[PDB]
Design a protein around this nucleic acid. Structure first.
Ligand SMILES: Nc1ccnc(=O)[nH]1
Length: 73
DNA sequence: AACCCTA
């Protein structure tokens, strides 16, 4: 199985997901095995597009890990 | 109050 899930995260919350030097998001990539793409900043947008791609288990785990981070902030 | 990776 290989599909993509799309979400949108406000600009002020994406730093918590990424972490300093991208350490947090890199960890989420490594643990989940999912391909994760956070869009470049868009000056006329309040949020960032995030795409999670991979197996059903990988996408689910990536989403779980993202929610853990969001639930702190 | 807001970490900037991968690609
Ligand atoms: N208020 C919100 C917090 C986290 N994620 C959202 O999409 N919205």
């Amino acid at each position: 199985q290989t599909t993509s899930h799309e979400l949108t995260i406000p600009n002020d919350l994406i730093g918590c997901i990424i972490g300093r030097q991208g350490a947090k998001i890199n960890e989420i990539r490594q643990m989940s095995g999912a391909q994760i793409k956070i869009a470049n900043p868009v000056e006329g947008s309040t949020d960032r597009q995030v795409t999670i791609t991979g197996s059903a288990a990988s996408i689910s785990l990536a989403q779980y890990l993202i929610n853990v981070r969001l639930s702190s902030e």
